[PDB]
Design an enzyme around this catalytic site. Structure first.
Site, short mmCIF file in Angstrom:
data_model
loop_
_atom_site.label_atom_id
_atom_site.label_comp_id
_atom_site.label_asym_id
_atom_site.label_seq_id
_atom_site.Cartn_x
_atom_site.Cartn_y
_atom_site.Cartn_z
N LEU A 113 -22.26 72.05 -14.77
CA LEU A 113 -22.69 71.40 -13.19
C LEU A 113 -21.75 70.59 -12.57
O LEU A 113 -20.97 69.84 -13.64
CB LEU A 113 -24.16 70.77 -13.51
N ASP A 114 -21.88 70.28 -11.48
CA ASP A 114 -20.91 69.42 -10.75
C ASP A 114 -21.48 68.13 -10.58
O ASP A 114 -22.68 67.94 -10.68
CB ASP A 114 -20.26 69.97 -9.51
N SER A 115 -20.89 67.02 -10.33
CA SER A 115 -21.58 65.52 -10.00
C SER A 115 -22.55 65.67 -8.94
O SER A 115 -23.66 65.07 -9.34
CB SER A 115 -20.24 64.39 -9.88
#
Ligand SMILES: CCCCCCCCCCCCCCCCCC(=O)OC[C@H](COP(=O)([O-])OCC[N+](C)(C)C)OC(=O)CCCCCCCCCCCCCCCCC
Ligand SMILES: CCCCCCCCCCCCCCCCCC(=O)OC[C@H](COP(=O)([O-])OCC[N+](C)(C)C)OC(=O)CCCCCCCCCCCCCCCCC
Ligand SMILES: CCCCCCCCCCCCCCCCCC(=O)OC[C@H](COP(=O)(O)OCCN)OC(=O)CCCCCCCCCCCCCCCCC
Ligand SMILES: NC(=O)C1=CN([C@@H]2O[C@H](COP(=O)(O)OP(=O)(O)OC[C@H]3O[C@@H](n4cnc5c(N)ncnc54)[C@H](OP(=O)(O)O)[C@@H]3O)[C@@H](O)[C@H]2O)C=CC1
Ligand code: SF4
Ligand code: SF4
Ligand code: SF4
Lengths: 158, 320, 115, 388, 210, 176, 84
Positions: free
Chosen positions: G38-40
């Site tokens: 996942l991304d931040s």
């Protein structure tokens, strides 16, 4: 007596038209300068009320909207809101260069180039500002435009 | 081409598209959307109207200065048709009534008028002719509306062989007379008149997809001479559809009005059509072939029915 | 020189903090906005748009440019929360009337001279 | 925050000042917070002026405070003339004071009558616009336009007074004090009017100056300040008149100040009519003012200057000035920057209504909702200049 | 005062007094004042480093020989050639001494300017106008937000690089039943005129050759 | 020099106090306000009977635009474009060419009457009195397109209104 | 009342709902940024879910640390003072 359906519809159409033009209650957006000339059309010299045109009408009893000044982009949504709330039959009168097509801010980033981009317009009154007499001529032109309506006569032939 | 009708600009309001369209029936439900889309891209729209000029005022904002032109016409007077299509390249025909009147019956709105508009269009040099029909059109259908749609569709295909005939299903939208019919007529003053609602399967199509489909048929050169069928993504059960409509409008649904002058609202033939089953004609091309994706009912049904709603919702069940 | 007065953040770590906070306020808000404004989009479409707006400004690395981006994003939120906007302003993010604009050479070549 | 009432004058009434969106928090009948939102008549006027010559930009100033048309023109002309280092001739300075005071009467009739109209007193509005209608004829006879005259221009005035105008102005001024008296017979001692204005929207002298107020808004609180008396600009040093000063800083004193300014304007107009001197009307310098149409069709130099003046325009030396006048609403000033070419580089308009409206929240504290109508009226707000 | 009917007379006593006060202010606030100039039509300007706003505005307001109690105006000028493109201008008025003074400073897109509201409550809306039109951020401002432009309006119109007609225009769309913004297309493009004459008009303002 | 608009001190004798008591209880000033309104009811109204009666104008009035001719019938306009250059609203669009007889005449002259501010700068700038603002102020239209004047329209207005326009110029040209 | 194993039940229940997270790769210790990928931005969405689930606010300083479910459960425990 003897009378056709065509004759009856023509006479009833004249009655409702006479009533609608004889009792035009206008809503006025006094957006800018042209509102000052709209106020002079109500003052003693011209006295629009003597034609049956009330000085002040609420948006939801109004019969005609008079757009008197510049319509900016910030204001355009509100003007369309008022227009939708007006019960039919509803007519718009565009007063002055700004409302007619943008006028002297036509090339501005914040100005609608004519109120016909937002609402349908029936009469265009030129001037910057149109003189109180020039607006009165415009309203009397709307009365003649209403006089020529044929709503019932069309309905009969549908 | 001609130097005037060469597209210019970026497809916006003040741009030029080279489409010079005459749209008959421009003041109806389907007409207001076609004129709107033709006018977004800077087309020249001629609007022949039978009604009062007041009834056309909603079309005026839809175009730039000069782009929308209005004309009088009478379906019986051919020379009024010619003045309307003389300078046009495409002639779209959206004329119809959900009901008969004293002056025009279903065989005059759907057969004699469309054939006259198509013949004059041929003799006036017009190139493209869009004619609207019905998906369920059938010579052997009880509903007189659809039997007239069948014959009229037959005469267009002979008068104007290069004509694009579009066959939509029941079209739904804000001003439709399909979902607005299930929300109002069924509810106020009545309990549903559904006649064996479990036996009817319906495939409805969104208005904008039909509007998009019609435009691309003008701009697409392979559409000429082809008949199309515009149908929604899903097939629904007429019973469930009415039920789903009610849930959206927050009107309770309990399983189980004379025609008159003015404007018959609910009629003998309308029921016969709401019960006819949406024919499946696989060989006919559909919205897929014009670059339009049919839009789900569920997305664009809260939009239609938020007005009826007074002052957490589950979809309907599709039929494979 | 490279000695510059700061807006709020004194380095990207602080700036990325405020960016992160501002995304929280927007993520919570979309459910309310889609109701108060009676929008026709789903809350999923709304939250994707907030993701899209935050993503387009990914490359930025200057701490000051990020402060202003956050300052502007909060002013946008303050308008939507206090309902100073209208249904028309909120729906301008979605460009629902602009027709598809191509991005492949042949498509742009057919229509016009624009590069 | 008992309730937030977002009051939009979008469905406007017969005021014509413009449209104001007002966002308020009403803790009952009382007002706790007032927040004017003022973008609705923003037309980008200051940016548009950058693409126009100095002459082309002048009509923009008619359309700012569109009830003070010729006073806005004078401010622009006094600013441009100052950068040009020229002087308008003595006759035009008297015409510009004369029509400056006819404009002050025009403004105060609108200010007082529409203020009273909003507070229910409709009749004086009709009484006095029969007078404004007669004043609109003076505007039309000298310029050809009832409202946006475009008459006061850098260097002087466009044309000379037509023969017979000064007599008609004197006839109007002779009967006009009685018209004011009728207005005071309906409002000055009326207990209902006093109850609606007395001790409403009080402003202290110290808060007035810091908030940027000018005009009646200062003099109502007792500040002895008038630009016509302290920084005179045309012939105002040559006319005797008194400045009305308030004592309580409320609406009622501000109402009295305006009504007394109308009387002093008639006093000044009387002196202008008697002291009008002869001579030319625009600076006799054809690199700024266009030559007469007879000379332009006879003289090569006049045709050249005519040709260039109406195309390129006169170039203004580089520099920046802030010029202000005592406009009817308050101090009207323009900050005008010249880059040396014939088009202004920057034209910032200082509208007195911009500060006054920003001071609304301060004044509305601890008043009922119906008072806010009275507070806005006594400020004399027109949104042409608030937004520009 | 000379018999030159068309030439604005010079007031030399005002020029002398304003020059004396320009030194006085420069002597008292040397930390901040960068330049003092008085124009030919008698208008004193003090140029200051952006950090001296509050000390400079406070001194002019409160000093017993300044008493510039009134903020007549506050605006910004955009000069894109300068590295600090924005010039912030303060016009103040003294009623005790019947005099005016201009205070000027500068900033860029990414440098905040201290809010003067602590000194002049009049500056509250002026700075909102500066932010909205010029995008100059003021720090410690009670409520900074747009004041003139429409909600959701991208850009700062009074920057010299913002196009006159902007990028988006509004219309009403029947299909979506609302006012929609779209890319601007003008039926008639604004016609730009080249009006500058190729001959010098004012030798006194000639700039030295490169 | 200033005056005090409201710095009176009310007298505190019984006779004066009773005067204010009589005023408060008997509504004296309110009756006086009713008197003024009663007097106006018997004054003659200032209304005029439009359209049969018209408001007074002057020769300088700025109304609808028209293109004029010389007595011979040749158009006065020489396509110098001074009006187009001065127009504050950019309402005028001009194209020109050499006419078949080599004359300097326009082929396009347009005024967007919805852009125009009716300022009359164009008639001030014209060297040959070709463009004027006429005396007509009653030309409102039903459609926007009817307010975009081309050369034919403005020539027709000049032919229509020359009789009045010439007299108005005669009355004011010395002031100009 | 507390049920330290109860916490882990809900945390895995919440993460199972997040559409991006594939159920299979999920583990009590799977890393959001690396294993899951996942991304931040997505990490902030997940934390907001837990605030609703466990009825309290997870500050930003702490939120960046909670980079895998095991960290979340530990952090949830400390604020609730579960000593199991
Ligand atoms: C038919 C009765 C049904 C019930 C209706 C409702 C209840 C009964 C009310 C009856 C209305 C009575 C008022 C009628 C007004 C007549 C118009 C008028 O005043 O003339 C001046 C107007 C004056 O014209 P103008 O309006 O253009 O004046 C312009 C202004 N000046 C003149 C100053 C420049 O005359 C007309 O134009 C005639 C208008 C049409 C009138 C149609 C109504 C007549 C009745 C027809 C009934 C048909 C029944 C079928 C047979
Ligand atoms: C309570 C008493 C109060 C005082 C009296 C009130 C006024 C009474 C006098 C006025 C009566 C007028 C009735 C017509 C109403 C207005 C009609 C109208 O505006 O047109 C809209 C419509 C026009 O029809 P339409 O269908 O074209 O309008 C809709 C258009 N589309 C479809 C595009 C949306 O008119 C009518 O509906 C008329 C209804 C029937 C009117 C009676 C006709 C009977 C005579 C003909 C039969 C003769 C046979 C022989
Ligand atoms: C309607 C006709 C009005 C007449 C014109 C106005 C008028 O004459 O009234 C003025 C008169 C004096 O009032 P005022 O100016 O205030 O000075 C009085 C000193 N105490 O004011 C009066 O004296 C009027 C007093 C009227 C008596 C009271 C009303 C009683 C109502 C019941 C009968
Ligand atoms: N919407 C649907 O569910 C479907 C519609 N269609 C077809 O779509 C077309 C239009 O749809 P819709 O817009 O809903 O139809 P509408 O009834 O909404 O509008 C029909 C148009 O036809 C005009 N018209 C009707 N009768 C006549 C006549 N006798 N002479 C002249 N003009 C006439 C009307 O003009 P006025 O109002 O002026 O009388 C109106 O503008 C019709 O042809 C219909 O058959 C086909 C399948 C499904
Ligand atoms: S048209 Fe002229 S008078 Fe009317 S609002 Fe616009 S600028 Fe003012
Ligand atoms: S009157 Fe003024 S705005 Fe109108 S065309 Fe002439 S110069 Fe242009
Ligand atoms: S109207 Fe007059 S100013 Fe305009 S182009 Fe013709 S001659 Fe020149």
């Amino acid at each position: 007596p003897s009378s056709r359906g065509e004759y009856v519809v023509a006479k009833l159409d004249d009655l409702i038209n006479w009533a609608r033009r004889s009792s035009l209650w206008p809503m006025t957006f006094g957006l800018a300068c042209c509102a000052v000339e709209m106020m002079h059309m109500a003052a003693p010299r011209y006295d629009m009320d003597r034609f049956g045109v009330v000085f002040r009408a609420s948006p939801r009893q109004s019969d005609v909207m008079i757009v008197a000044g510049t319509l900016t982009n910030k204001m355009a949504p509100a003007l369309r809101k008022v227009y939708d709330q007006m019960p039919e039959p509803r007519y718009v009168v565009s007063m002055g260069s700004c409302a007619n097509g943008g006028g002297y801010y036509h090339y501005s980033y914040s100005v609608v180039r004519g109120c016909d981009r937002i609402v349908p317009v029936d009469i265009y009154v030129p001037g910057c500002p149109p003189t109180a007499e020039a607006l009165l001529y415009g309203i009397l032109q709307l009365q003649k435009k209403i006089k020529r309506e044929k709503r019932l006569r069309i309905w009969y032939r549908r | 081409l001609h130097h005037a009708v060469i597209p210019h600009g970026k497809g916006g309001r003040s741009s030029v598209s080279g489409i010079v369209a005459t749209v008959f029936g421009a003041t109806g439900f389907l007409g207001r959307y076609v004129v709107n889309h033709l006018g977004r891209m800077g087309s020249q729209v001629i609007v022949p109207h039978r009604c009062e000029p007041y009834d056309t005022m909603h079309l005026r904002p839809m175009g730039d200065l000069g782009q929308i032109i209005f004309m009088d016409w009478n379906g019986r007077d051919k020379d009024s048709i010619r003045r309307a299509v003389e300078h046009s390249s495409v002639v779209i025909n959206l004329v119809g009534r959900e009901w008969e009147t004293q002056n025009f019956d279903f065989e005059d709105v759907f057969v004699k008028i469309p054939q006259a508009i198509a013949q004059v269009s041929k003799e006036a040099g017009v190139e493209k002719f869009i004619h609207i029909s019905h998906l369920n059109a059938d010579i052997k259908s009880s509903s007189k509306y659809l039997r007239s749609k069948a014959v009229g569709e037959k005469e267009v295909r002979e008068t104007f062989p290069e004509a694009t005939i579009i066959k939509p299903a029941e079209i739904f939208g804000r001003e439709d007379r399909f979902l607005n019919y299930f929300a109002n007529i069924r509810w106020f003053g009545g309990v549903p008149l559904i006649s064996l609602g479990k036996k009817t399967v319906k495939q409805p199509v969104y208005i904008v997809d039909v509007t998009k489909g019609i435009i691309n048929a003008i701009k697409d050169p392979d559409a000429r001479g082809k008949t199309f069928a515009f149908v929604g993504p899903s097939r629904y059960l007429l019973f469930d559809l009415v039920q789903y409509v009610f849930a959206v409008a927050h009107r309770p649904f309990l399983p189980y009005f004379e025609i008159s002058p003015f404007e018959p609202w609910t009629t003998r033939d309308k029921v016969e059509r709401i019960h006819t089953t949406d024919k499946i004609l696989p060989h006919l091309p559909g919205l897929e072939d014009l670059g339009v994706e049919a839009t789900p009912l569920e997305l664009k049904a809260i939009e239609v029915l938020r007005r009826h709603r007074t002052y957490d919702v589950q979809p309907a069940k599709t039929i494979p | 020189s490279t000695s510059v007065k700061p807006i709020f953040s004194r380095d990207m770590n602080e700036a990325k903090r405020r960016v992160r906070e501002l995304y929280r306020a927007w993520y919570r808000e979309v459910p309310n906005t889609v109701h108060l404004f009676q929008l026709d989009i789903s809350v999923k479409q709304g939250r994707d748009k907030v993701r899209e707006m935050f993503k387009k400004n990914a490359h930025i690395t200057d701490p000051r440019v990020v402060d202003l981006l956050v300052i502007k994003g909060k002013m946008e939120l303050e308008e939507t929360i206090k309902v100073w906007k209208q249904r028309t302003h909120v729906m301008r993010f979605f460009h629902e009337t602009e027709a598809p604009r191509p991005k492949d050479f042949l498509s742009k070549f057919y229509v016009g001279h624009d590069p | 925050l008992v309730s937030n009432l977002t009051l939009n004058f979008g469905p406007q009434h017969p005021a014509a000042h413009g449209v104001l969106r007002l966002v308020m928090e009403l803790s009952g009948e009382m007002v706790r917070k007032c927040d004017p939102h003022i973008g609705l008549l923003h037309r980008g006027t200051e940016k548009l002026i950058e693409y126009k010559t100095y002459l082309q930009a002048l009509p923009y100033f008619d359309r700012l405070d569109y009830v003070s048309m010729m006073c806005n023109e004078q401010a622009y002309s006094l600013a441009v003339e100052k950068l040009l280092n020229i002087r308008p001739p003595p006759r035009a300075q008297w015409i510009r004071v004369l029509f400056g005071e006819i404009t002050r009467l025009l403004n105060h009739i609108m200010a007082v009558t529409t203020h009273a109209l909003d507070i229910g007193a409709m009749t004086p509005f009709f009484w006095m616009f029969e007078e404004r209608e007669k004043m609109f004829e003076f505007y039309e006879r000298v310029s050809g336009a009832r409202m946006h005259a475009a008459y006061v221009r850098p260097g002087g005035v466009h044309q000379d007074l037509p023969l017979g105008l000064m007599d008609d102005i004197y006839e109007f001024s002779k009967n006009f004090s009685l018209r004011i008296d009728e207005l005071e017979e309906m409002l000055t001692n009326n207990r209902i009017w006093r109850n609606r204005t007395v001790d409403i929207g009080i402003v202290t002298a110290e808060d007035a100056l810091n908030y940027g107020f000018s005009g009646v808004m200062l003099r109502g609180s007792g500040i002895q300040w008038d630009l016509r008396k302290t920084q005179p600009y045309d012939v105002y040093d040559q006319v005797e008149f008194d400045v009305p000063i308030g004592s309580r800083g409320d609406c009622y004193d501000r109402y009295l100040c305006r009504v007394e300014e109308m009387r002093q304007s008639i006093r000044i107009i009387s002196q202008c009519l008697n002291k009008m001197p002869p001579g030319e009307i625009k600076v006799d310098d054809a690199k700024v003012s266009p030559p007469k149409r007879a000379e332009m069709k006879t003289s090569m130099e006049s045709l050249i200057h005519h040709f260039k003046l109406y195309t390129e325009g006169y170039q203004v030396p580089p520099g920046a000035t802030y010029t202000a006048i005592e406009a009817p609403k308050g101090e009207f000033g323009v900050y005008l920057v010249s880059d040396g070419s014939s088009r202004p580089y920057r034209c910032k308009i200082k509208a007195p209504g911009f500060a006054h409206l920003a001071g609304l929240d301060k004044m509305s504290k601890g008043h009922m909702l119906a008072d806010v109508v009275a507070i806005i009226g006594t400020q004399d707000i027109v949104f042409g200049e608030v937004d520009r | 005062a000379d018999t030159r009917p068309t030439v604005r007379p010079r007031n030399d006593v005002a020029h002398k007094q304003l020059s004396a006060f320009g030194e006085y202010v420069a002597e008292i606030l040397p930390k901040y004042v960068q330049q003092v100039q008085v124009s030919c039509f008698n208008e004193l300007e003090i140029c200051i480093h952006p950090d001296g706003v509050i000390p400079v505005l406070t001194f002019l307001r409160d000093h017993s020989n300044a008493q510039f109690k009134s903020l007549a105006d506050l605006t910004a000028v955009d000069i894109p050639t300068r590295q600090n493109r924005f010039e912030i201008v303060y016009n103040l008025l003294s009623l005790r001494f019947n005099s005016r003074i201009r205070v000027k400073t500068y900033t860029d897109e990414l440098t905040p300017i201290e809010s003067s509201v602590p000194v002049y409550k009049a500056a509250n809306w002026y700075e909102r106008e500066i932010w909205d039109m010029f995008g100059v951020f003021f720090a410690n401002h009670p409520d900074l937000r747009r004041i003139l432009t429409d909600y959701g309006f991208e850009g700062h119109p009074f920057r010299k690089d913002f196009p006159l007609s902007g990028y988006v225009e509004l219309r009403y769309d029947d299909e979506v039943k609302r006012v929609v913004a779209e890319p601007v297309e003008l039926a008639q493009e604004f016609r730009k005129f080249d009006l500058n004459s190729p001959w010098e008009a004012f030798p006194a303002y000639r700039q030295p050759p490169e | 020099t200033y005056k005090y608009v409201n710095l009176r001190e009310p007298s505190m004798d019984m006779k004066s106090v009773t005067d204010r008591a009589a005023q408060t209880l008997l509504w004296t000033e309110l009756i006086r306000g009713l008197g003024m309104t009663l007097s106006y009811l018997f004054r003659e109204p200032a209304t005029i009977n439009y359209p049969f009666e018209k408001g007074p104008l002057s020769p300088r009035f700025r109304g609808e635009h028209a293109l004029r001719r010389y007595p011979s019938g040749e158009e006065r306009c020489i396509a110098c474009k001074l009006c187009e250059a001065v127009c504050p609203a950019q309402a005028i669009t001009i194209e020109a060419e050499p006419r078949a007889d080599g004359s300097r005449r326009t082929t396009r002259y347009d005024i967007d009457m919805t852009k125009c501010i009716y300022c009359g700068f164009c008639q001030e700038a014209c060297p040959v009195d070709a463009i004027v603002e006429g005396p007509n102020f009653e030309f409102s239209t039903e459609t926007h397109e009817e307010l975009l004047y081309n050369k034919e329209k403005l020539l027709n207005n000049g032919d229509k209104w020359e009789a009045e326009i010439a007299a108005n110029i005669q009355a004011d040209y010395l002031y100009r | 009342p507390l049920t330290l194993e109860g916490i882990k039940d809900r945390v895995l229940y919440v993460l199972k709902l997040y559409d991006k997270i594939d159920p299979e790769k999920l583990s009590v210790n799977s890393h959001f940024m690396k294993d899951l990928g996942l991304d931040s931005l997505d990490q902030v969405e997940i934390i907001m879910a837990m605030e609703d689930e466990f009825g309290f606010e997870i500050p930003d300083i702490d939120a960046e640390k909670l980079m895998c479910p095991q960290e979340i459960v530990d952090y949830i425990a400390d604020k609730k003072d579960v000593y199991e």
